[PDB]
Write a protein that binds this ligand. Structure first.
Ligand SMILES: N=c1c2ncn3c2ncn1[C@@H]1O[C@H](COP(=O)(O)OP(=O)(O)OC[C@H]2O[C@@H]3[C@H](O)[C@H]2O)[C@@H](O)[C@H]1O
Length: 252
C-alpha cells in the first residue's frame, strides 16, 4: 500500500457499471444509436484489455468495440480540440453547431475515466495503471484515444475547425494527439480547409497569436498536405460564448 506497481492512477471506481450506464443513457437520447446492445458494447470494451499485459495493448484489441460503436457524424461540422475541453464542450452544447469526439458514443463512454487490467488474471487494477511517460505508451487508455481520434479525423470533410489553448508555451504541440494523429489523418481528397481558433487566456488587449512560431509550423505542415490553413484569435472567450447564445446582443 506504500508502493504501487505502476506510476499512473488506478482504474476509476465502479468502472464497469459506469460504462454500462453511460451507454444506456447515450442510446436513450440519440435515435441513430437507439438499437445498440449495451451489454455487447461492454463485453467488447472489456475484451480489449482484460487478461492482457497493460504495456502490450494494440489498436487491433479495440476493433470489436470500434465495429459495435460504428456511427456517422456530419462530416462538415467537426470540431477538433487540444487542451481546452471545457470551452469546446460549452460551445457545442448551445445549439449543436459542431460535434467533438465526446459527442460520439465511444468518446462519451470513456471521457474522464482511467482503466487497466493484468496479464493472466481477469481482474481490473483499481490500485495503479501505467503512466504514458514513465512506464509505457502502449497502455489501455492511450491506445484507445489514439484509435478513436484517428477514425474521427478520417471522417472529416469540407472546413474542419480546431480549438487551441493560447495560454500554453506550445500553442500547437507536435507531440499532442492533435499534432501527432489528427493533423496526419485528415484526408486531403475530402478536406478543403483547417481553421484554427486560438483561445486567449489573458487580459483583454493582447498579441496576434496567429503569428506564433508554432502556428506558422502548423500552417506549413497542413499546406504541404494540399489542405488550406486559416487562423482566428478569440480574445475574450466569455464574450464569444455569450454571442453564440445571444447573437442579437449589440456588443457582438
Ligand atoms: N476526453 C479525453 C480524456 N478524458 C480524460 N483523459 C482524456 N484523454 C483524452 N480524451 C480525448 O482524447 C483527445 C486526445 O487526448 P490528448 O490531447 O492526448 O490528451 P492529454 O492532454 O495528453 O491527456 C490525456 C490524459 O487525460 C485523460 C486520460 O486519462 C489521460 O491519458 C482529447 O483532445 C480528448 O478529445
Amino acid at each position: 500500500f506504500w508502493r504501487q506497481t505502476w506510476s499512473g492512477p488506478g482504474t476509476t471506481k465502479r468502472f464497469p457499471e459506469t460504462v454500462l450506464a453511460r451507454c444506456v443513457k447515450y442510446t436513450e437520447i440519440h435515435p441513430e444509436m437507439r438499437h445498440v446492445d449495451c451489454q455487447s458494447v461492454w463485453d467488447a470494451f472489456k475484451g480489449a484489455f482484460i487478461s492482457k499485459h497493460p504495456c502490450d495493448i494494440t489498436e487491433e484489441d479495440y476493433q470489436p468495440l470500434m465495429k459495435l460503436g460504428t456511427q456517422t457524424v456530419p462530416c462538415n461540422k467537426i470540431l477538433l480540440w487540444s487542451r481546452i475541453k471545457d470551452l469546446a464542450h460549452q460551445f457545442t452544447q448551445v445549439q449543436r453547431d459542431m460535434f467533438t469526439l465526446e459527442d460520439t458514443l465511444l468518446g462519451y463512454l470513456a471521457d474522464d475515466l482511467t482503466w487497466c487490467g493484468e496479464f493472466d488474471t481477469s481482474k481490473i487494477n483499481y490500485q495503479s495503471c501505467p503512466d504514458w511517460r514513465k512506464d509505457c505508451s502502449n497502455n489501455p487508455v492511450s491506445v484507445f484515444w489514439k484509435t478513436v481520434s484517428r477514425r474521427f479525423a478520417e471522417a472529416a470533410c469540407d472546413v474542419v475547425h480546431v480549438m487551441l489553448d493560447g495560454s500554453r508555451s506550445k500553442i500547437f504541440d507536435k507531440d499532442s494527439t492533435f499534432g501527432s494523429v489528427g493533423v496526419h489523418n485528415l484526408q486531403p481528397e475530402k478536406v478543403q480547409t483547417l481553421e484554427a481558433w486560438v483561445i486567449h487566456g489573458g487580459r483583454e488587449d493582447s498579441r496576434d497569436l496567429c503569428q506564433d512560431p508554432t502556428i506558422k509550423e502548423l500552417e506549413s505542415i497542413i499546406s504541404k498536405r494540399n489542405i488550406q490553413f486559416s487562423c482566428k484569435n478569440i480574445y475574450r472567450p466569455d464574450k464569444f460564448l455569450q454571442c453564440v447564445k445571444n447573437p442579437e446582443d449589440s456588443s457582438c
